[PDB]
Amino acid sequence: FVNQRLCGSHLVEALYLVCGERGFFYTPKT
Amino acid sequence: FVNQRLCGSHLVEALYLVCGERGFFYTPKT
Amino acid sequence: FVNQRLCGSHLVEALYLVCGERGFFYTPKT
Amino acid sequence: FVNQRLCGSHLVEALYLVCGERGFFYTPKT
Amino acid sequence: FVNQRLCGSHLVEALYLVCGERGFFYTPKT
Amino acid sequence: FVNQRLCGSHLVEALYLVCGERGFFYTPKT
Amino acid sequence: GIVEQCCTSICSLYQLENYCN
Amino acid sequence: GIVEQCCTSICSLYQLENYCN
Amino acid sequence: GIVEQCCTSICSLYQLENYCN
Amino acid sequence: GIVEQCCTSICSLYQLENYCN
Amino acid sequence: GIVEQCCTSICSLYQLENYCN
Amino acid sequence: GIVEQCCTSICSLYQLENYCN
Ligand SMILES: [Zn+2]
Ligand SMILES: [Zn+2]
Numbered sequence: 001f002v003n004q005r006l007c008g009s010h011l012v013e014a015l016y017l018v019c020g021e022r023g024f025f026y027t028p029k030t
Numbered sequence: 031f032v033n034q035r036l037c038g039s040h041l042v043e044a045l046y047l048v049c050g051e052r053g054f055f056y057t058p059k060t
Numbered sequence: 061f062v063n064q065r066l067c068g069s070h071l072v073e074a075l076y077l078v079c080g081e082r083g084f085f086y087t088p089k090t
Numbered sequence: 091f092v093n094q095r096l097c098g099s100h101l102v103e104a105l106y107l108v109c110g111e112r113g114f115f116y117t118p119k120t
Numbered sequence: 121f122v123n124q125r126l127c128g129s130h131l132v133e134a135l136y137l138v139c140g141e142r143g144f145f146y147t148p149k150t
Numbered sequence: 151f152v153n154q155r156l157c158g159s160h161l162v163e164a165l166y167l168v169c170g171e172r173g174f175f176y177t178p179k180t
Numbered sequence: 181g182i183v184e185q186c187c188t189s190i191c192s193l194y195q196l197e198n199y200c201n
Numbered sequence: 202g203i204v205e206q207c208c209t210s211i212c213s214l215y216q217l218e219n220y221c222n
Numbered sequence: 223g224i225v226e227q228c229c230t231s232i233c234s235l236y237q238l239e240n241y242c243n
Numbered sequence: 244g245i246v247e248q249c250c251t252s253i254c255s256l257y258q259l260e261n262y263c264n
Numbered sequence: 265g266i267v268e269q270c271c272t273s274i275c276s277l278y279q280l281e282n283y284c285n
Numbered sequence: 286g287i288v289e290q291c292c293t294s295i296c297s298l299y300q301l302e303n304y305c306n
Contacts, residue, residue, distance in 0.1 A: 001281075001299060002170035007292035009046050009070060010129060014167055016042040016056065017277070018298050019305035020152035026046065026304070027053035027222055030286040031215070031239070032080035037208035039160060040099060041217075044207075047074055047235065048214050049221035050062035056220075057306065058204040061218075061236060067229035069106050069130060076102040076116065077214070078235050079242035086106065086241070087113035087201055090223040091194070091260070092140035097187035100159060101196075104186075107134055107256065108193050109200035110122035116199075117243065118183040121197075121257060127250035129166050136162040136176065137193070138256050139263035146166065146262070147173035147285055150244040151278070151302070157271035161280075164270075167298065168277050169284035176283075177264065178267040193256070214235070277298070 006014050015024045036044050045054045066074050075084045096104050105114045126134050135144045156164050165174045182199060185191050203220060206212050224241055227233045245262055248254045266283060269275050287304055290296045 001168065001297055002172065003295045003297045004167070004170050005292060005295050009043050011287065011291050012042050012046045013039050013163065014298065015301055015304055016039050017154070017164055017167060018151055018301045019056075020154050021058050022152060023055070023057040023306040024304050025053065025055045025222075025306065026049075027286065028051050028288050029053060029222075031078055031213065031235070032082060033211045033213050034077070034080050035098075035208065035211050038155075041204060041207050043073065044077055044214070045217055045220060047064070047077060048061065048217045050064050052062065053222040054220050055222065055306075056204070057202060059202050061234055063232045063234045065229060065232050069103050071224065071228050072102050072106045073099050074235065075238055075241055076099050078238045079116075081118050083115070083117040083243040084241050085113065085115045085201075085243065086109075087223065088111050088225050089113060089201075091138055091192065091256070092142060093190045093192050094137070094140050095158075095187065095190050101183060101186050103133065104137055104193070105196055105199060107124070107137060108121065108196045110124050112122065113201040114199050115201065115243075116183070117181060119181050121255055123253045123255045125250060125253050129163050131245065131249050132162050132166045133159050134256065135259055135262055136159050138259045139176075141178050143175070143177040143264040144262050145173065145175045145264065145285075146169075147244065148171050148246050149173060149285075151276065151298070153274045153276050155271065155274050161267060161270050164277070165280055165283060168280045173285040174283050175264075175285065176267070177265060179265050
């Protein structure tokens with residue numbers, strides 16, 4: 001694939017798309 | 031606030047809004 | 061909860077999440 | 091333009107796009 | 121209607137809303 | 151990556167994320 | 181109303197315009 | 202879990218808060 | 223307005239409740 | 244292109260129709 | 265087509281790639 | 286973190302896999 005910019009809710013939307021049923025963690029502070 | 035039905039990516043968007051900088055874990059069943 | 065930045069459609073998405081069946085008004089001009 | 095099915099937050103996004111700076115009222119039934 | 125700014129995924133969301141079943145092409149490079 | 155159900159605008163968002171600068175064609179059936 | 185019609189049925193962008201300020 | 206409850210049923214923002222870090 | 227305190231600055235979901243009907 | 248008139252500038256839904264098939 | 269398959273069934277990101285320019 | 290390489294810079298869907306459980 002390619003690389004792109006993902007800010008705010010768009011990043012979590014992408015994580016949902018990529019991880020799906022595996023689940024994921026969104027940790028900005030880290 | 032009110033109750034609501036949140037499916038797919040909409041739940042992730044809701045978690046993002048509610049948690050903010052705290053971050054969150056998205057963990058679907060099996 | 062916490063505070064965050066909500067621009068354009070993200071703001072209306074948040075209003076929908078918070079207000080739900082109560083409905084809401086989105087008035088930029090005000 | 092075309093007709094379409096708009097449920098939940100998707101309707102709010104559509105209203106945002108159609109109304110723009112004019113703003114809008116989101117008023118679901120009872 | 122009015123005019124507005126549509127960046128990234130928001131632009132494709134708008135194309136989907138406007139074109140619907142007619143389909144559309146999203147070509148950034150052009 | 152994982153498989154998933156993508157309806158309406160969600161499919162367009164997925165295409166946007168997967169294709170990036172390459173762009174894409176959204177072509178629904180009849 | 182429009183919120184119900186758009187989801188249970190279908191609606192146009194022109195019908196949505198009736199709800200702009 | 203919460204992912205299933207929110208979609209097959211309904212859920213509150215307060216219940217969602219249990220899943221913030 | 224709602225914008226002056228969300229896009230340019232920051233706003234809370236609590237404040238958003240001010241715009242519900 | 245579609246981008247040069249939407250993200251950097253501003254575009255109308257009418258203009259978006261130009262990209263439908 | 266892919267638009268129908270992804271919604272009535274399920275689809276992969278790899279299948280979606282076939283529709284990139 | 287995930288942010289430092291997506292909003293300020295750019296990131297790939299491959300890298301996003303690093304945050305799946
Ligand atoms: Zn955005
Ligand atoms: Zn949806």
